[PDB]
Ligand binder design. Structure first.
Ligand SMILES: Nc1ncnc2c1ncn2[C@@H]1O[C@H](COP(=O)(O)OP(=O)(O)O)[C@@H](O)[C@H]1O
Ligand SMILES: Nc1ncnc2c1ncn2[C@@H]1O[C@H](COP(=O)(O)OP(=O)(O)O)[C@@H](O)[C@H]1O
Lengths: 196, 196
């Protein structure tokens, strides 16, 4: 396989606090975590560097490895392909870093079908009303999108109860509380990443 | 029918500028536009008032008028129903106001099936790259959600070319330019709303 710390799959409804928890996790563990570099077929832009911003490849090569099952997520628009390869995730693992995969539910099931063996964590709000208060606070939603988000979050919370889907489900009632649970769930992989 | 100004249906990819255009439209035309008040079956919260924040009704009543085809959009979570009724839209029209319907593509087709006769306007970015620059600027997206938004916006731009779907398609290259086109498209309904 690929030796190194197991990746972490982070999922949950938008606005529940998984970004706030992740930012604190990174700021308190520099050199421990990493993010996979995406593949694309579009042209590089000023300042971009291969292997850091993207892996720049041809459409023929990218399509070949999509068919080979490498890509846990991929999309296409304006004739250019984009995606995240399991090989790019293993490349972070090879550097003795915990690769962080912040994905929705469809991404979880795509990762479940690969040879990757990550830890699956769901960050859920304590209630739909708290999530509504959270979403109304950031002032990003119409009435249509706010209600659509709350309804979609309900199905997200319900699918989180599916047996074996997630290793850890964190209810973000208190942030300091939720963050401590996140660290404890990752404590063994953090220790492995702390090795040379 | 219901006499008064025709409602306006505003659609387009998130981040293309339809909220910025709408805010300027409201701030330069007070008393001219209005927003429909939604129906819900949930309990009122502190400070909320019937007929202003929501129309509070029973589940039996709301289900009856959903089956009657009143609701251009509706959703349910935690045992409570939410939705926008064509009657609430006509109630804004009855006050000689232009009712603003800011909805996605599915909302457009739901409105198309009612007795409402609004003006259908699509606000599109000049390119997907401009939209990406716009989305990256507001710092709300993961890499997964950013690419998903760009791909979804491509299908949104493509469906905007569907014959007869939209009365006006506004390409938001320059904001002052796009806003002037928005005012001109609504100039006759604004004049009607300016009548007593
Ligand atoms: N721990 C928390 N307590 C209260 N509100 C929160 C918390 N975390 C997030 N929010 C609200 O949710 C919004 C976005 O949450 P975020 O941290 O991005 O979670 P996610 O990554 O799941 O969207 C924030 O603007 C804030 O208003
Ligand atoms: N006219 C514009 N020119 C440049 N950037 C814009 C413009 N309108 C919107 N944006 C970018 O898009 C983001 C949100 O756009 P918004 O006005 O909410 O459009 P929408 O309502 O379609 O989401 C803004 O934070 C801004 O970065």
């Amino acid at each position: 396989h690929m030796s190194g710390p197991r990746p972490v799959v982070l999922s949950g409804p938008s606005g529940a606090g998984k970004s706030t928890l992740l930012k604190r996790l990174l700021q308190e563990h520099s050199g421990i975590f990493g993010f996979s570099v995406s593949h694309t077929t579009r042209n590089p832009r000023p300042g971009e560097e291969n292997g850091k911003d993207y892996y720049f490849v041809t459409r023929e090569v990218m399509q070949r490895d999509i068919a080979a099952g490498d890509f846990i997520e991929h999309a296409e628009f304006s004739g250019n392909l984009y995606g995240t390869s399991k090989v790019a995730v293993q490349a972070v693992q090879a550097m003795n870093r915990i690769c962080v995969l912040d994905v929705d539910l469809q991404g979880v099931r795509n990762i479940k079908a690969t040879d990757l063996r990550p830890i699956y964590i769901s960050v859920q709000p304590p209630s739909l009303h708290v999530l509504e208060q959270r979403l109304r606070q950031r002032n990003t939603e119409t009435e249509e999108s706010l209600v659509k988000r709350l309804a979609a979050a309900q199905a997200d919370m319900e699918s989180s109860k599916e047996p074996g889907l997630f290793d850890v489900v964190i209810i973000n009632d208190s942030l300091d509380q939720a963050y401590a649970e996140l660290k404890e769930a990752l404590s063994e992989e953090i220790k492995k990443a702390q090795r040379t």
